[PDB]
Amino acid sequence: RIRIRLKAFDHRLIDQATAEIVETAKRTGAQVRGPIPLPTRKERFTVLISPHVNKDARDQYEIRTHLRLVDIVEPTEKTVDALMRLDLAAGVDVQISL
Amino acid sequence: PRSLKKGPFIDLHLLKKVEKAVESGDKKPLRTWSRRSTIFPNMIGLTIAVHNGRQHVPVFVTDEMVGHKLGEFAPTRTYRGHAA
Amino acid sequence: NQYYGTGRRKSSAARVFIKPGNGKIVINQRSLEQYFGRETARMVVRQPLELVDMVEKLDLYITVKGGGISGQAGAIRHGITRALMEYDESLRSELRKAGFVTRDARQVERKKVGLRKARRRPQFSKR
Amino acid sequence: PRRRVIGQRKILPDPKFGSELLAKFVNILMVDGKKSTAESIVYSALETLAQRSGKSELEAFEVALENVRPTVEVKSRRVGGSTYQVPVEVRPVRRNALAMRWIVEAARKRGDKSMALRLANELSDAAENKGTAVKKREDVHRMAEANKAFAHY
Amino acid sequence: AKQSMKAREVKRVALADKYFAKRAELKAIISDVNASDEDRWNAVLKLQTLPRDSSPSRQRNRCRQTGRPHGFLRKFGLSRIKVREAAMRGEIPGLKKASW
Amino acid sequence: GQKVHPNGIRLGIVKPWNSTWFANTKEFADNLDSDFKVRQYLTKELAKASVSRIVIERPAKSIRVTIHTARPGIVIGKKGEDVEKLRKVVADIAGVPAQINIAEVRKPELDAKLVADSITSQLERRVMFRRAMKRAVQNAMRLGAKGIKVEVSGRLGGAEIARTEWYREGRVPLHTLRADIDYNTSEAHTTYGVIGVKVWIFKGEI
RNA sequence: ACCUGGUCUUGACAUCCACGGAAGUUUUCAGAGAUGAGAAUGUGCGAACCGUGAGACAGGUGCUGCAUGGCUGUCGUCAGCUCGUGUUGUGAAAUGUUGGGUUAAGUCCCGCAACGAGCGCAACCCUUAUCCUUUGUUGCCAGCGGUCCGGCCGGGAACUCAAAGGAGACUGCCAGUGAUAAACUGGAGGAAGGUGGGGAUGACGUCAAGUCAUCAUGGCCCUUACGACCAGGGCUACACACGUGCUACAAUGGCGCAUACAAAGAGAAGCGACCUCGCGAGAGCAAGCGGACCUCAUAAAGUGCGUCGUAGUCCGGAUUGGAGUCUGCAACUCGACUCCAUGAAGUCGGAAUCGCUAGUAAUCGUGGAUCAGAAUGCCACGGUGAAUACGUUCCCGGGCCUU
Ligand SMILES: [K+]
Ligand SMILES: [K+]
Ligand SMILES: [K+]
Ligand SMILES: [K+]
Ligand SMILES: [K+]
Ligand SMILES: [K+]
Ligand SMILES: [K+]
Ligand SMILES: [K+]
Ligand SMILES: [K+]
Ligand SMILES: [K+]
Ligand SMILES: [K+]
Ligand SMILES: [Mg+2]
Ligand SMILES: [Mg+2]
Ligand SMILES: [Mg+2]
Ligand SMILES: [Mg+2]
Ligand SMILES: [Mg+2]
Ligand SMILES: [Mg+2]
Ligand SMILES: [Mg+2]
Ligand SMILES: [Mg+2]
Ligand SMILES: [Mg+2]
Ligand SMILES: [Mg+2]
Ligand SMILES: [Mg+2]
Ligand SMILES: [Mg+2]
Ligand SMILES: [Mg+2]
Ligand SMILES: [Mg+2]
Ligand SMILES: [Mg+2]
Ligand SMILES: [Mg+2]
Ligand SMILES: [Mg+2]
Ligand SMILES: [Mg+2]
Ligand SMILES: [Mg+2]
Ligand SMILES: [Mg+2]
Ligand SMILES: [Mg+2]
Ligand SMILES: [Mg+2]
Ligand SMILES: [Mg+2]
Ligand SMILES: [Mg+2]
Ligand SMILES: [Mg+2]
Ligand SMILES: [Mg+2]
Ligand SMILES: [Mg+2]
Ligand SMILES: [Mg+2]
């Protein structure tokens, strides 16, 4: 079994990669579990907007990190080599675990 | 204060200055800027001139000054009261 | 068979399982009087049953998470009500007449910039 | 408010007796949102009051209210010239709100030990037209009496 | 920030790496519970001899684009002012105005 | 009073980001600083190439720069010579293998960054500020904008008392979030100081 | 960014040229250090990188926010502010935008020398309240089957939940009212009812409002100094006056024991379990975790039992003595925390004054940014959970018409 963890700042970009990870896997023999929507992280930032004083004038920002889990149970041999060469889109973090 | 497992602190350049003068009869005042140095049981006698920011003030090291830092004997701020 | 109800209140959510019995109540593997020491909480939990007169005709299996005493007690009361309606559907009229069907949507208002809390402003002074 | 868009809020009846009237009295007594701490104080004072008389907790409570409820009060009224304290009829709900508030305020001022005992001694004197709260109801009726001439402003 | 003040931080960053391993084993001795009592003393005296600018506690995070020593944010390496300018131009990935 | 940045408020709604990579905290600050130095170089080198928008990606241990422009032949050069000269400087700066893509800005009269830069170059040549703003507004309205607004601030015409002036045609509904509003700014460095230019261009609700 | 003293002059930071040299490593003395004088080892792969020498220059947190850009406060999230064409007036201007109703709304309808349009309002965005669909681990446990009673294991995909996609509210429905209108009042259904709750969003403009010390910039000014380097001091002073907070004056409490129920978040020079040692702050040893898995990390208020019995107290915890811990080259000036002792004012606060209309106020804990260390501040999170609003004469600010 190999573990697939997917990170991205855009949940639409992260669903494209998952849709094509669970498609280039069921074809090449192995079966899939998931994808799993792990809890989204929400990192928040608060800054003062004025160059000088005005302490109550602020902007509140946020970065959302979306998470996906894909389980390839029983990986066939044509399945593995069909994974590192898929080349996913930019801005999608991919971590392979065994 | 400074942890016991580390021993009292002393600026190395001052430790050489007291060594080179305890073995000799040098009673000339020792001019240092090291207000952070703990007073050790080895220079009870001579006068260290400690900096207070704008000059060196001589302190005559006795026994009861052991354990204190040098700066405790060189006040930095000048006060005489308001309208006094 | 078994009947189910999901109840929510504040940050609490209660899973309720209703089946014919004699009137025994378990909440997180504890008795009603063991779990809820507050007297108000015990009355809130019971309230739907004293209304429809099915107090000792049922057995209550209940798990709850999150929130506090009054939230969980109120969350159970909501999920209980949703269970009884899955039991008999003619009870909706009298339960809604008692305000038990409504999910109470009151939540903690967020803290906002420049305020001490959600609405408390710092003390003001002209000069 | 200017727009008059303020309805009413439902209050749960008290646990032991199922009286919304008594549940409001716990609310007036409660501080810092510690309601259970106030529920206990009211229940203890109510039992001391139930055994100091022959009536149940409620009937002894109502008799205390009947002697503290004001019937007429004065409100200011600035008109073309100056302000007169006009006597106005107190509406039935405000009668109970004032009676409870004066009782709780009087009991907090006493010098007994616990608050449960202080509340008990006030609820008992209120049954005999003694102590504060009852006196506060007397001072209000007097003011509204000395201003009966202004009963048309 | 002034040019001189910017160049003070690049020096303190260089000196903190050149003496990094030499500083860590000295504190290994001083913190060593079962060392002796005179090499500890020597290690203490030797640590004072290294230039002060070699300690990482002498560094001050600065805005990487202006040099501002206040209002720093580590996630972006910028002051609160430059973070706002880049965020509104869409130059910080995923960063948008928050509301909940 | 002060208005929200029209681009920032729409960044997840109808507008895309200008940088689209992913990183943890460990390198987030270092990616931002290398994007800054890249854009700092590209903007100075290609000053006469009508560069509207520099989009930066980072697929995997590599950087991909997409330069939106209206004079791509000037960007590329003869048989791709010049675009190669930059592909080396960018790799030097970013420290990874570099790849440059050239996008086509057709109708530069409808791009806020190019319109703002056009007005600004004219002001540094001592063109009458009034003539520049009217020309910009008329051009964009003729090419099919649903609206445009141009604002110029500073010592206009070298006047001692600075002021702000603005024109507008059509619709520029800044409170509508789903409005395609291209917005950008520019600065002119005249003999009397800085003059700031802002340009809004409305292209229709989405 | 300041002071005192010690120091430098194409220079700490750029470019250009000349010449010297790989760069680097390893140690000695003088000095507070800057630095100076050396002394070893390498010499690899022009052009890296150092040193020196010239002069174009660099450098300035120096002045002007009343020369500016950018950014911000503010009236005010107030319902306003305008334009084209037409028409009226010698003209400034007017009309539209006023009027009758209505609305949170220049909201909408009707009338109308106006007819249209723009910026604002509303809507589109985020979040919260109900349901569906998909997916089922690190999250879940209804029915099963075992069990060391631990979802612990086999399993299960039901449920809570996680996050994607959908559904849902429109005065749509009904009745009355109303000018056959806009709308309003009430009822049904529904998780939610009339802008559902909260946020984001700030029109034309105003105060020559704030910022030349984030940055940028016109002009002015300094250039062996207003630039640059260093050590020590200062920004922590203290007859006093004000603003914003924290903790109290107690019994709705203090103390002791026992015992429940959260949300949100952070972590690799990081968070750090277990175990042992220490009264304690901590120490030693050392797993696990780039995390729905591991760590921070026991929520506290609450509840049960005891005690204290109205006292400047078993309230309060300021101050001071002594002894320690930890971070850090270094806690004298000037750190936080621990232990023992000390046990100040204070018993509810003059004139006056502030916040808040509901999950609000009040009260109770928890986290985060900055950050080696250093919150009673700031930003965020849940627990408990009120009172009251008859009304619009008065106070303050504002909107529309009129004089
Ligand atoms: K300005
Ligand atoms: K006239
Ligand atoms: K007109
Ligand atoms: K200037
Ligand atoms: K200092
Ligand atoms: K404070
Ligand atoms: K005491
Ligand atoms: K200190
Ligand atoms: K006070
Ligand atoms: K800290
Ligand atoms: K008037
Ligand atoms: Mg996390
Ligand atoms: Mg709260
Ligand atoms: Mg500068
Ligand atoms: Mg620091
Ligand atoms: Mg000097
Ligand atoms: Mg100004
Ligand atoms: Mg005319
Ligand atoms: Mg008007
Ligand atoms: Mg008019
Ligand atoms: Mg009208
Ligand atoms: Mg309108
Ligand atoms: Mg009209
Ligand atoms: Mg709006
Ligand atoms: Mg079983
Ligand atoms: Mg209704
Ligand atoms: Mg704003
Ligand atoms: Mg001014
Ligand atoms: Mg000023
Ligand atoms: Mg200044
Ligand atoms: Mg210094
Ligand atoms: Mg200060
Ligand atoms: Mg005590
Ligand atoms: Mg932290
Ligand atoms: Mg006293
Ligand atoms: Mg007392
Ligand atoms: Mg309000
Ligand atoms: Mg608190
Ligand atoms: Mg109006």
From Swiss-Prot, chain A:
InterPro entries: Ribosomal_uS10, Ribosomal_uS10_CS, Ribosomal_uS10_dom, Ribosomal_uS10_dom_sf. It comes from Escherichia coli (strain K12). PANTHER family: 30S RIBOSOMAL PROTEIN S10 FAMILY MEMBER. One of its GO terms (molecular function) is tRNA binding. Keywords: Ribonucleoprotein, Ribosomal protein, Ribosome biogenesis, RNA-binding, Transcription, Transcription antitermination, Transcription regulation. The keyword Zinc-finger does not apply. HAMAP family: Ribosomal_uS10. Gene3D superfamilies: Ribosomal protein S10 domain. The gene is rpsJ. PROSITE patterns: RIBOSOMAL_S10. It comes from the Bacteria. This is Small ribosomal subunit protein uS10. Belongs to the universal ribosomal protein uS10 family. Involved in the binding of tRNA to the ribosomes. Part of the processive rRNA transcription and antitermination complex (rrnTAC). The complex forms an RNA-chaperone ring around the RNA exit tunnel of RNA polymerase (RNAP). It supports rapid transcription and antitermination of rRNA operons, cotranscriptional rRNA folding, and annealing of distal rRNA regions to allow correct ribosome biogenesis. In complex with NusB is involved in the regulation of ribosomal RNA (rRNA) biosynthesis by transcriptional antitermination. One of its GO terms (biological process) is transcription antitermination. Pfam families: Ribosomal_S10 (PF00338). One of its GO terms (cellular component) is cytosol.
UniProtKB/Swiss-Prot annotation, chain C:
InterPro entries: Ribosomal_Su5_D2-typ_SF, Ribosomal_uS9, Ribosomal_uS9_bac/plastid, Ribosomal_uS9_CS, Ribsml_uS5_D2-typ_fold_subgr. GO terms for cellular component: cytoplasm; cytosol; cytosolic small ribosomal subunit. Belongs to the universal ribosomal protein uS9 family. NCBIfam families: PRK00132.1 (NF001099). Coiled coil: none annotated. The C-terminal tail plays a role in the affinity of the 30S P site for different tRNAs. Mutations that decrease this affinity are suppressed in the 70S ribosome. GO terms for biological process: cytoplasmic translation. PROSITE patterns: RIBOSOMAL_S9. The keyword tRNA-binding applies. The keyword Hydrolase does not apply. Keywords: Ribonucleoprotein, Ribosomal protein, RNA-binding, tRNA-binding. GO terms for molecular function: RNA binding; structural constituent of ribosome; tRNA binding. It holds the Pfam family Ribosomal_S9. This is Small ribosomal subunit protein uS9. Part of the 30S ribosomal subunit. Contacts 16S rRNA. Cross-links to the P site tRNA and weakly to the A site tRNA.
Swiss-Prot record, chain D:
GO terms for biological process: cytoplasmic translation; negative regulation of translation; ribosomal small subunit assembly; translation. One of its GO terms (cellular component) is cytoplasm. It holds the Pfam family Ribosomal_S7. Changing M115G: Significantly decreases affinity for its own mRNA. Keywords: Ribonucleoprotein, Ribosomal protein, RNA-binding, rRNA-binding, tRNA-binding. Gene3D superfamilies: Ribosomal protein S7 domain (1.10.455.10). The keyword Ribosomal protein applies. GO terms for molecular function: mRNA binding; rRNA binding; structural constituent of ribosome; tRNA binding. InterPro entries: Ribosomal_uS7, Ribosomal_uS7_bac/org-type, Ribosomal_uS7_CS, Ribosomal_uS7_dom, Ribosomal_uS7_dom_sf. The strain K12 sequence is shown. PANTHER family: RIBOSOMAL PROTEIN S7. Belongs to the universal ribosomal protein uS7 family. One of the primary rRNA binding proteins, it binds directly to 16S rRNA where it nucleates assembly of the head domain of the 30S subunit. Is located at the subunit interface close to the decoding center, where it has been shown to contact mRNA. Has been shown to contact tRNA in both the P and E sites; it probably blocks exit of the E site tRNA. Protein S7 is also a translational repressor protein; it regulates the expression of the str operon members to different degrees by binding to its mRNA. Part of the 30S ribosomal subunit. Contacts proteins S9 and S11. Cross-links to IF3 and the P and E site tRNAs. This is Small ribosomal subunit protein uS7.
From Swiss-Prot, chain E:
GO terms for cellular component: cytoplasm; cytosolic small ribosomal subunit; small ribosomal subunit. Keywords: Ribonucleoprotein, Ribosomal protein. It comes from the Bacteria. GO terms for biological process: cytoplasmic translation; ribosomal small subunit assembly; translation. One of its GO terms (molecular function) is structural constituent of ribosome. Part of the 30S ribosomal subunit. Contacts proteins S3 and S10. Belongs to the universal ribosomal protein uS14 family. Binds 16S rRNA, required for the assembly of 30S particles and may also be responsible for determining the conformation of the 16S rRNA at the A site. This is Small ribosomal subunit protein uS14. It comes from Escherichia coli (strain K12).
